[PDB]
Write an enzyme that holds these catalytic residues in place. Structure first.
Site, PDB file in Angstrom:
ATOM      1  N   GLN C 200       0.809  -1.221   0.000  1.00 53.31           N
ATOM      2  CA  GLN C 200       0.000   0.000   0.000  1.00 53.31           C
ATOM      3  C   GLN C 200       0.846   1.277   0.000  1.00 53.31           C
ATOM      4  O   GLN C 200       0.303   2.381   0.070  1.00 53.31           O
ATOM      5  CB  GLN C 200      -0.991   0.004   1.178  1.00 53.31           C
ATOM      6  CG  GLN C 200      -2.046  -1.111   1.117  1.00 53.31           C
ATOM      7  CD  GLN C 200      -3.097  -1.046   2.228  1.00 53.31           C
ATOM      8  OE1 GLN C 200      -4.294  -1.222   1.982  1.00 53.31           O
ATOM      9  NE2 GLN C 200      -2.650  -0.815   3.455  1.00 53.31           N
ATOM     10  N   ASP C 258       7.302  -5.428  10.215  1.00 54.94           N
ATOM     11  CA  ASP C 258       8.348  -4.962  11.120  1.00 54.94           C
ATOM     12  C   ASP C 258       8.496  -5.912  12.302  1.00 54.94           C
ATOM     13  O   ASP C 258       8.455  -5.501  13.456  1.00 54.94           O
ATOM     14  CB  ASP C 258       8.059  -3.521  11.587  1.00 54.94           C
ATOM     15  CG  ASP C 258       6.580  -3.288  11.965  1.00 54.94           C
ATOM     16  OD1 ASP C 258       5.677  -3.768  11.243  1.00 54.94           O
ATOM     17  OD2 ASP C 258       6.318  -2.595  12.979  1.00 54.94           O
ATOM     18  N   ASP C 372      -9.042  -6.182  14.269  1.00 58.65           N
ATOM     19  CA  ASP C 372      -8.658  -7.491  14.779  1.00 58.65           C
ATOM     20  C   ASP C 372      -9.592  -8.008  15.863  1.00 58.65           C
ATOM     21  O   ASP C 372      -9.916  -9.192  15.889  1.00 58.65           O
ATOM     22  CB  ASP C 372      -7.186  -7.507  15.249  1.00 58.65           C
ATOM     23  CG  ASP C 372      -6.864  -6.446  16.326  1.00 58.65           C
ATOM     24  OD1 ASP C 372      -7.775  -5.705  16.783  1.00 58.65           O
ATOM     25  OD2 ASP C 372      -5.667  -6.369  16.712  1.00 58.65           O
ATOM     26  N   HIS C 396       7.792  -7.683  18.134  1.00 59.66           N
ATOM     27  CA  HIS C 396       7.215  -6.552  17.442  1.00 59.66           C
ATOM     28  C   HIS C 396       7.391  -5.278  18.238  1.00 59.66           C
ATOM     29  O   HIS C 396       7.620  -5.315  19.443  1.00 59.66           O
ATOM     30  CB  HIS C 396       5.746  -6.809  17.123  1.00 59.66           C
ATOM     31  CG  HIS C 396       5.142  -5.796  16.201  1.00 59.66           C
ATOM     32  ND1 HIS C 396       3.947  -5.165  16.473  1.00 59.66           N
ATOM     33  CD2 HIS C 396       5.572  -5.294  15.019  1.00 59.66           C
ATOM     34  CE1 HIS C 396       3.660  -4.328  15.491  1.00 59.66           C
ATOM     35  NE2 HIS C 396       4.632  -4.384  14.598  1.00 59.66           N
TER      36      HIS C 396
HETATM   37  O1  LIG Z   1      -1.321   4.971   6.809  1.00 61.59           O
HETATM   38  C1  LIG Z   1      -1.226   3.786   7.100  1.00 61.59           C
HETATM   39  C2  LIG Z   1      -0.925   3.400   8.401  1.00 61.59           C
HETATM   40  C3  LIG Z   1      -0.665   2.054   8.659  1.00 61.59           C
HETATM   41  N1  LIG Z   1      -0.996   1.094   7.731  1.00 61.59           N
HETATM   42  C4  LIG Z   1      -0.902  -0.350   8.054  1.00 61.59           C
HETATM   43  O2  LIG Z   1      -1.498  -0.611   9.314  1.00 61.59           O
HETATM   44  C5  LIG Z   1      -0.741  -1.535  10.069  1.00 61.59           C
HETATM   45  C6  LIG Z   1      -0.488  -0.968  11.466  1.00 61.59           C
HETATM   46  O3  LIG Z   1       0.090   0.323  11.401  1.00 61.59           O
HETATM   47  P1  LIG Z   1       1.529   0.652  12.076  1.00 61.59           P
HETATM   48  O4  LIG Z   1       2.502  -0.443  11.832  1.00 61.59           O
HETATM   49  O5  LIG Z   1       2.082   1.925  11.560  1.00 61.59           O
HETATM   50  O6  LIG Z   1       1.182   0.776  13.652  1.00 61.59           O
HETATM   51  P2  LIG Z   1       1.754  -0.244  14.766  1.00 61.59           P
HETATM   52  O7  LIG Z   1       1.453  -1.637  14.348  1.00 61.59           O
HETATM   53  O8  LIG Z   1       3.222  -0.076  14.909  1.00 61.59           O
HETATM   54  O9  LIG Z   1       1.108   0.057  16.065  1.00 61.59           O
HETATM   55  C7  LIG Z   1       0.543  -1.820   9.288  1.00 61.59           C
HETATM   56  O10 LIG Z   1       0.574  -3.172   8.875  1.00 61.59           O
HETATM   57  C8  LIG Z   1       0.531  -0.866   8.102  1.00 61.59           C
HETATM   58  O11 LIG Z   1       0.865  -1.518   6.897  1.00 61.59           O
HETATM   59  C9  LIG Z   1      -1.301   1.485   6.436  1.00 61.59           C
HETATM   60  O12 LIG Z   1      -1.474   0.645   5.555  1.00 61.59           O
HETATM   61  N2  LIG Z   1      -1.411   2.827   6.124  1.00 61.59           N
HETATM   62 MN   LIG Z   2       3.485  -2.924  12.939  1.00 63.65          MN
END
Ligand SMILES: O=c1ccn([C@@H]2O[C@H](COP(=O)(O)OP(=O)(O)O)[C@@H](O)[C@H]2O)c(=O)[nH]1
Ligand SMILES: [Mn+2]
Ligand SMILES: O=c1ccn([C@@H]2O[C@H](COP(=O)(O)OP(=O)(O)O)[C@@H](O)[C@H]2O)c(=O)[nH]1
Ligand SMILES: O=c1ccn([C@@H]2O[C@H](COP(=O)(O)OP(=O)(O)O)[C@@H](O)[C@H]2O)c(=O)[nH]1
Ligand SMILES: [Mn+2]
Ligand SMILES: [Mn+2]
Lengths: 628, 628, 628
Positions: C200, C258, C372, C396
């Protein structure tokens, strides 16, 4: 080298092979990060591994600077270590608060062929209130400390000819050992001129199998003097008597017969005595024979206002150097860095200069207890202070559960305490109320604990004191048997081997927790008084209500019962304590009558006792009880 | 390699051989599970065993990221380590709360023949409030860290030509050593252009036996300037004077003569200065010379509302890195991760840019105390901030029990404090009440403690301040002797070598516990006031009531006595403090009269002092007191 | 051997070479008394010294018995270790209280030539509430554990064909790494059939230099799908969409880009899924990427009564296995032995069976947050429970200081929370008051903290929810830009790189301690309300009153100021929060108006949202937003 050996104050000593690790904390304190234990080939040398640290901030090897500053003429001390290997000597001092200060450090490189010598001169100026000096070693390569010592900057004044006195009473095995350990270190042997052993016992130290070997090493520096049982007073008085008349020794060193020894302790006390600003009594501390890493006390005083021996102001009994190192940030360890001032030293190790003993004369004929304090207080009045040296110790039997002030000795505590009190109470008039109120407390506690014999023998104590000094001297021998005769009467003074020698207890024992809550000590005492007014049931004098362990047998448990067994403090037997209202009020009246007598007649006792001192402390007078 | 050496910010350094284990915690922090200690062949290399971990989260080797982010232009720093063996470098950062964050990790394999190089670029973005960067090493096989350093991503701006200034006063031995340690590290030597030593003492640093050797290594970068005793102000003023007139050095680095040195400290401060966003004063921290694992302070400020120097908001004095590691979950360690902002740095290590010193001019002629703060506050008003760099330190004598603000210095604290106060009190009018109420508290405490001389010399302080700036400059030399002349009068200001120089105390000392209970401080103070109203018994000025140790000598103990000895804070002597009601109320009146004068005339003092600054800080004016 | 490999549930794994000692506590727990560290030649083998003990009571190697008992058909598990040397394997279990029970022990003797095999069958019967099984090894001679594993007593049912889904958004480097770590362990590679990466982002994972190498190892099991930014929902929805249409995979495993990986984690989850009593969602835990010994949570639930995601009943966030071992007598460790029941697993690792995803359909178009949980709650309503498996984890990024619910996400929390609330609130009517009272608290706190933008974007959240499901779907892409547009207005939502970008603070910061005393929170709040009624001084919007660190910036500090800078939670910048009474009461009114709307219209929202689920979760409907 000529001049080095004659200015040595105290050596750096290590432990013997296979010494418990607890006791090794008296000598050297190793980092838990070192790869291996340090090894002590000889009692004067130490091998340390590579990349390791050991700290000599320990009871035996640290220098008690403040004491040397206060009482000796030494302006500064010199550390000398002789080392091989590459490493660093770090010298530290403390303030009297325990705060550690880094002084200087020396990197060394030495080989066995060209051994490195490291000297540091530490000035004694900043130790008014207290403080120690010590050193650590930190290694690059493996290091051997071949020798180490604290030195004065000039020779020791005077000559070192020590009369060692060891009074013995039915402890031949122990005494033979004390004579054996004197000749162990050549540097002690050299400065011993005479060894007096007054043998007041019926089982003689001469009769021992190991004695001839021990006596041979002393040559004819040793004499044994048979005399009647005259207790401590008579024992040590004899030693003084002999050393002043039959030897030309410059020092008199009192010792006990049941003592383990660190020979450098003897040398350290001698060092201070010789370097003293003015003539003075110098004594050693006692380490606990049965818990050998524990120091008994840093120093004792006689507390005016109750006239009772006590710990010096900033010192607490029983200091375990294994649990609380000299250099720990804990509150118990912080008191060790203060300079403690004593009123007297105990006669386990106490050195008296010759023309000081000559001036003060003998001890008082007290049999046991207070003889030593009296001597300290007396010397003090003549301008001869006492210093209890830290780091200079023998191991002696302490009161490590084993002893008590309720048995026959309870007579000799009170009696001698009053004798000595009359001797040294240079203070206010109305003050004697504080000692008698002190005794009333003790006496009520005794009775509450059913310890009746104690009170009885204490009432003899006050009677014997009031008869004066002339009388005290005549009962030097006769008094001990007399106490026992009185004690036979009371069931609480007759020891029986087991509690199973008696009919099983009516009640099983219950855990009764120590009341230290104000509301509860008030109620537990009220129960005590009120029950103590009821007529005792005699069935409980034939079958004990409890089997009381020593530990659990305090005022709050014993004041509710009419009869119970209590285990002796050694744990070798039990007495059957039995309450009786009629016998108690009698003892209580006799105690009250004597306390009233004391405050009435104390002014009078001061006068007659002080006047009688030239006699009581005369060599001529002691002759008539020491010689057949 | 050409460009590497000119962008090096701070090296990874190890301890010297045989360094105490306490001090090694400043450099590297080893796991108690490693089989063996780590070895440091050279001060820049380290050997680690197989299957072992060592953490460089330490005062000296961790990178104080937040500081670099805040004051320098560096967007990111680069860790470079050169290693042999198999193992892993783990890079961590912290948040300003102390929370540890793992950044990245690199597994390496290196041999001595093809040594492994490990580079990690850490961006400085997430360090607004604070935070550090550091690395650990964890080994598979045995590992050697051959070198390690933190680097900027471009060369250092400007040129590095440092004027090192070291004012000395009767401490030749120490000074000779400071000159010796400057030339130790070639990388410091290279960037030193001049070394000014104003010798204000009568025992000259030139006369020392070890000096010629030390001076030879400096060549003619070294000049010695004989001048009268003009204290700190005069010492450092001279250094400024010289470096600005007789050298073309880009930096002026103030140092002390009684300092141990980590040469990389000098290089780190230089690094920051050169990389600064804007021109600024950059200073180093002080580690305690007498407790060498302890950091004195992270940074100081001047507290408005009482105008008094103090610890910066989130920093506490005396931080022992051996007991509280940089990376421990304890509350003391958690404050180290905040970015501390200072108002000034102390002159033990403080670097001043050339055209900044030129602009600010000289220091104020304060003799000692406050000269440094004034300079910090002055530079601040011109837009030149001060940064106290962590990890860049010299060892200096602290107030580790040794010092006090009751003796002659008490004059110079108060006097200079007010001088500086008038200079920088850009705030509200009614505010001066807070400083004078502050002094009234101090002054009542002094008198309660019988420290009479203190109050007297403090009343001279307020008189001398009120006479203005023209007058302060003329008494630069004359003032010190004048304080002493005044102090001779008071028994509490005359040091005597021992308390045994005086007649023994009437009472033995009793342990009196610190009252921090509201009811008890109320009562202990009431006793204080009421007794302090009674006529003092003069028998207690001839024989002291107590022998008070420094530690035990506070308001609550001294307010009940009429006379007692108190041990000096170094523990080298005692003063005989003696209460007198007549003399006290006099001092108290004179103090009250001066405090009323202050709040009346402070508006006026601000005006006349601020106006006189171009003169007081002129090179031309300082000439007439610096040159014969 | 044929049958062994197909019944392996989880292997005994060791750490990599040079792994931090903290992280090794996840694998094996060694006795500090062992002479040497244990060595791990390969990730499946371990060498232990002679006379040593190591305990495998660790997060990774202990068997989470209660979980297997509860959700799988396994009646018993079999430990198999293959060992050489002489030693003993001791098998332990726990009760759900943490109490450790010794089961059986086997002495072994093995050589490399005839290696000793040790099998123990542990019956899963006594694990109703919780409990683990593990083993220790205790050695006579040196021992090598060649392999070890937990086994079922029969083959795994079904076939193992896993669709791994990894949605990526502008994190190419991280994503390339995730694809690389999937093919690391051959035993994972073997059971991976497809790897879907919905890209994306505008910085594509295909463009990366290291990608071709990574993609080659996957062959054509890998497809990359370019689509617009549709957040998490859109990412994972795409993966489902693909795996159900374009692959015949039996399992769908959601992952993040990540994430660091323990490949056996993937195998363990697969094991449970295949052995499940009934079809179910099976998920892995998350370990903290930035504090890698710390477990984030044992399991999460959705708390009815406020409808808010929370820790499961007996589980606390952030459990450091280095500080609190699985087998310690501490209270934090004791909760790990309970069986935690979840409502959903996070999509870092969550396995969904094929005909379960087919039945439930897609995720809701929520962009981020709650997608989720909704899925977990939805599956639950169809009889498909979720189990969060312990011991099966990926690393993570957590909320390790870095994140917050005040920025743009605050919209997506509230909005989606309500969406999901309407979807699953099968409960009592009057219940919605609890969620709205919940929000009123949050909203008052925000305003008190001057976080105005938050409230604004949260009021858009409630507006967008009330517009219904049809509307939520159309703003899947448009909503994110819309939040930002709104946020530009507010000074508190505009990040500035440093606080030095602004004029220096009027007041220096003061340490204000956290009030948790009832009297003090009452007063600190009263000050807050009353000041918050006064007209804000605009001089404080031009020059901030403070430089507030994130940590210190709570309700009690911010309610007294009119303007101050607050450091972003990552610590990368600061916002200038500025109080305004007029703007605040406006936001507060709009918030009150929306909360009243909610409780009025929630009955209505439940009806219209539940009805719209077949559409919102349709593959056909998601086509019109996923395909160009
Ligand atoms: O503008 C955005 C923000 C996040 N995500 C997706 O949403 C998920 C969770 O977001 P993020 O990793 O930034 O937050 P975290 O998991 O670290 O709390 C990830 O898999 C990203 O690919 C996305 O597609 N577009
Ligand atoms: Mn993440
Ligand atoms: O009936 C006695 C009791 C003791 N002593 C002496 O008094 C001193 C102290 O007595 P003891 O050793 O029994 O008591 P402790 O010193 O252990 O407290 C010793 O030197 C004994 O020789 C004695 O001569 N006759
Ligand atoms: O009579 C004095 C007292 C001190 N100083 C100088 O003032 C500085 C600080 O004084 P000192 O070192 O004695 O105090 P400390 O720094 O230890 O607190 C030193 O650099 C000295 O050279 C001086 O020149 N003359
Ligand atoms: Mn004895
Ligand atoms: Mn100095």
């Amino acid at each position: 080298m000529s001049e080095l050996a004659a200015s040595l104050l105290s050596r750096v000593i290590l432990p013997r092979p296979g010494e418990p690790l607890d006791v090794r904390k008296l000598y050297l304190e190793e980092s838990t990060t070192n790869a291996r234990r340090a090894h002590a080939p000889t009692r004067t040398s130490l091998q340390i591994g590579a990349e390791s640290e050991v700290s000599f901030a320990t009871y035996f090897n640290a220098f008690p600077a403040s004491y040397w500053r206060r009482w000796t003429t030494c302006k500064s001390v010199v550390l000398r270590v002789q080392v091989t290997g590459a490493g660093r000597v770090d010298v530290y001092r403390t303030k009297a608060t325990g705060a550690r200060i880094f002084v200087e450090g020396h990197d060394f490189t030495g080989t066995e062929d060209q051994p490195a010598a490291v000297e540091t001169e530490v000035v004694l100026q900043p130790f008014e209130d207290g403080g120690w000096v010590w050193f650590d070693i930190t290694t690059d390569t493996a290091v051997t400390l071949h020798s180490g010592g604290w030195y004065a900057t000039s020779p020791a004044p005077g000559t070192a000819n020590i009369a060692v006195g060891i009074p013995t009473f039915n402890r031949p095995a122990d005494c033979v050992n004390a004579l054996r350990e004197l000749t162990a270190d050549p540097l002690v042997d050299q400065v011993i001129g005479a060894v007096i052993v007054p043998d007041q016992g019926e089982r003689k130290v001469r009769d021992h199998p190991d004695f001839p070997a021990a006596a041979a090493r002393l040559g004819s520096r040793l004499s044994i003097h048979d005399q009647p049982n005259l207790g401590g007073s008579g024992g040590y008085s004899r030693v003084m008597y002999e050393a002043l008349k039959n030897t030309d020794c410059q020092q008199i060193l009192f010792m006990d017969d049941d003592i383990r020894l660190e020979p450098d302790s003897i040398l350290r006390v001698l060092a201070m005595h010789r370097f003293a600003k003015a003539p003075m009594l110098v004594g050693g501390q006692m380490l606990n024979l049965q818990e050998p890493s524990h120091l008994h006390i840093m120093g004792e005083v006689v507390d005016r206002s109750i006239f009772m021996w006590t710990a010096a102001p900033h010192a607490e009994y029983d200091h375990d150097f294994a649990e609380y190192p000299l250099n720990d940030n804990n509150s118990r360890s912080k008191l060790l860095h203060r300079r403690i001032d004593v009123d007297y030293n105990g006669w386990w190790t106490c050195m008296i200069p010759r023309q000081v003993a000559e001036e003060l004369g003998q001890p008082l004929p007290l049999f046991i207890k207070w003889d030593d304090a009296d001597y300290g207080l007396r010397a003090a009045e003549h301008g001869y202070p006492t210093v209890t040296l830290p780091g200079a110790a023998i191991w002696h039997m302490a009161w490590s559960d084993k002893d008590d002030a309720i048995d026959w000795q309870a007579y000799f505590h009170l009696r001698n305490r009053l004798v000595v009190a009359a001797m040294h109470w240079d203070g206010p008039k109305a003050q004697v109320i504080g000692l008698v109120r002190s005794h009333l407390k003790a006496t009520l506690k005794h009775l509450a604990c059913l310890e009746y014999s104690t009170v009885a023998i204490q009432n003899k104590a006050i009677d014997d004191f009031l008869a004066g000094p002339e009388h005290i001297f005549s009962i030097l021998e006769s008094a001990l048997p007399q106490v026992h005769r009185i004690r036979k009467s009371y069931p609480d003074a007759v020891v029986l081997p087991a509690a199973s020698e008696l009919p099983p207890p009516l009640h099983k024992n219950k855990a009764m927790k120590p009341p230290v809550n104000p509301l509860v000590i008030g109620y537990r005492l009220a129960r005590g008084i009120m029950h103590n007014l009821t007529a005792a049931n005699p069935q409980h004098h034939r079958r004990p209500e409890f089997n009381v362990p020593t530990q659990d047998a305090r005022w709050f448990l014993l004041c509710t019962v009419d009869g119970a067994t209590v285990t002796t403090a050694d744990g070798c037997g039990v007495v059957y304590r039995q309450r009786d209202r009629a016998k108690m009020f009698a003892l209580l009246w006799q105690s009250l009558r004597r306390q009233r007598q004391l405050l009435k007649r104390f002014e009078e006792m001061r006068r007659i006792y002080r006047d009688a001192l030239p006699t009581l402390s005369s060599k001529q007078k002691w002759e008539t009880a020491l010689l057949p």
